[PDB]
Amino acid sequence: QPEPDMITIFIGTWNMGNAPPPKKITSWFLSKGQGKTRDDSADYIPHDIYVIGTQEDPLSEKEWLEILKHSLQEITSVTFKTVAIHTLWNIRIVVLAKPEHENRISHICTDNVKTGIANTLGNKGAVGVSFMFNGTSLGFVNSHLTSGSEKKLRRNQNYMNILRFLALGDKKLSPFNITHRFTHLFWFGDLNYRVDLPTWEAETIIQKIKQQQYADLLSHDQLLTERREQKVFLHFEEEEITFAPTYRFERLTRDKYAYTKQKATGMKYNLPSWCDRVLWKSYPLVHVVCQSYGSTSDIMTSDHSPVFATFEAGVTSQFVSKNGPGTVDSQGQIEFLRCYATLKTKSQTKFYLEFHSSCLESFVKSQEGENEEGSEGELVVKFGETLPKLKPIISDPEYLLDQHILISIKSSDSDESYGEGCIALRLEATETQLPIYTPLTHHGELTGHFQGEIKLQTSQ
Numbered sequence: 429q430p431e432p433d434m435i436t437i438f439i440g441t442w443n444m445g446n447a448p449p450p451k452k453i454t455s456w457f458l459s460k461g462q463g464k465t466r467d468d469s470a471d472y473i474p475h476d477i478y479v480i481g482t483q484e485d486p487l488s489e490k491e492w493l494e495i496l497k498h499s500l501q502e503i504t505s506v507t508f509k510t511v512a513i514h515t516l517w518n519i520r521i522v523v524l525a526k527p528e529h530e531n532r533i534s535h536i537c538t539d540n541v542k543t544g545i546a547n548t549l550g551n552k553g554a555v556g557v558s559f560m561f562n563g564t565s566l567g568f569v570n571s572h573l574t575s576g577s578e579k580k581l582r583r584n585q586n587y588m589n590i591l592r593f594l595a596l597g598d599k600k601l602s603p604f605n606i607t608h609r610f611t612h613l614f615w616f617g618d619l620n621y622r623v624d625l626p627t628w629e630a631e632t633i634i635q636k637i638k639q640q641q642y643a644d645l646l647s648h649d650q651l652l653t654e655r656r657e658q659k660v661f662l663h664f665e666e667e668e669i670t671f672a673p674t675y676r677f678e679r680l681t682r683d684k685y686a687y688t689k690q691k692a693t694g695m696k697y698n699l700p701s702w703c704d705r706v707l708w709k710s711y712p713l714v715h716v717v718c719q720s721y722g723s724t725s726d727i728m729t730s731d732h733s734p735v736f737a738t739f740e741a742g743v744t745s746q747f748v749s750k751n752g753p754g755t756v757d758s759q760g761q762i763e764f765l766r767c768y769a770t771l772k773t774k775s776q777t778k779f780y781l782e783f784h785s786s787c788l789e790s791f792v793k794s795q796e797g798e799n800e801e802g803s804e805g806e807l808v809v810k811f812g813e814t815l816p817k818l819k820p821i822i823s824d825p826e827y828l829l830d831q832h833i834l835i836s837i838k839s840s841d842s843d844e845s846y847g848e849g850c851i852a853l854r855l856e857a858t859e860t861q862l863p864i865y866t867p868l869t870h871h872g873e874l875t876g877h878f879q880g881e882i883k884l885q886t887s888q
């Protein structure tokens with residue numbers, strides 16, 4: 429039985445509106461409805477992993493697991509295994525996997541983050557799951573962010589609290605938040621970003637939706653505009669949206685958007701919006717392809733429609749050589765030339781680098797760089813030719829070229845990371861000086877850049 433080099437992953441997000449689901453929800457898991465939908469010829473093919481995020485979920489974990497498992501069994505004739513389930517209030521994530529994957533999955537973590545303070549603490553936040561699939565780390569986040577058209581800044585704040593405080597993946601990666609801990613990170617949920625148009629334009633918006641003319645609406649979508657302006661979800665991807673707004677519907681039909689202000693809405697309008705979203709961030713030069721992104725048309729118990737997304741995701745095998753793991757492989761090395769960090773900090777401390785990677789027996793600290801001033805005011809930390817030679821555990825190029833090096837630039841004074849980034853070893857050549865680059869972020873905000881050259885020696 430060969431190990432896979434690619435799996436498919438289903439992501440669902442559904443705000444259930446505190447109502448039980450209808451008797452049949454199979455269209456969701458089949459990626460059928462509006463948008464980028466899955467070919468009928470694939471309907472009996474199971475995805476490898478199904479990750480289901482709900483919000484406003486009224487069901488017990490047991491109730492929902494029985495619906496999900498019976499749904500997938502009806503579709504695929506496979507009895508899925510439960511990898512993990514975690515619930516914060518009415519926000520839930522379920523991870524299900526094909527039985528053949530049970531021994532490939534390990535290091536399962538779950539966590540939650542509650543957002544807001546006093547007033548604004550009590551129902552919004554995120555749940556998440558991580559695990560290893562053979563040699564590949566996978567992370568999944570289901571968030572229900574602050575509601576209301578005039579709270580986009582709060583949503584952005586909720587996002588930063590979630591990525592700072594959600595404790596998933598390898599704790600040894602102490603400088604790194606969830607946006608650096610995983611080969612593939614999927615973040616989805618009722619993110620609650622709205623189409624920012626005047627209230628008076630409500631019937632015009634509905635007209636456009638009925639004509640399937642989304643362009644003038646997506647240009648006002650707050651998540652797209654906040655992402656363009658680098659306010660949120662920096663360095664994540666989202667597939668093009670080609671499905672109607674998923675909120676806010678009258679229940680039991682999809683023929684009507686309920687947008688007008690009511691006591692029950694706090695006297696707020698709910699203009700039709702793409703509240704329900706799936707984004708991802710994968711390490712550089714790893715295969716990840718979105719093969720569906722859309723909404724169902726036939727599940728109408730909630731004021732939201734479910735959203736699906738599916739992905740091809742590259743994965744690697746759990747490599748054993750005669751040498752590593754449990755020692756170094758002397759035929760392997762990673763070298764760095766002409767390297768420097770450019771930082772936005774207004775502070776003057778010395779800095780050093782830390783290199784983290786599962787291809788190393790443990791993380792490596794550099795010497796301090798030499799600080800200089802850039803021509804436009806910047807701090808430039810020069811490492812030149814001074815960075816250490818990294819000694820990987822395995823030298824085989826079929827392993828090493830699939831690996832990544834995480835970099836943190838840390839203050840000598842405080843040992844606090846000022847920026848984090850990631851370099852792929854998927855090079856065009858070995859034993860050859862090649863340019864490398866990563867942006868540097870901290871708390872998911874851009875803080876600088878790291879650039880230079882790499883020289884990678886493998887056993888070939």
Ligand SMILES: CC(C)(O)CNC1CCOCC1
Nearest residue numbers: 665708709710711712713714
């Ligand atoms: C690295 C690449 C293949 O050129 C683009 N892939 C992106 C996928 C999602 O996260 C950021 C990287």
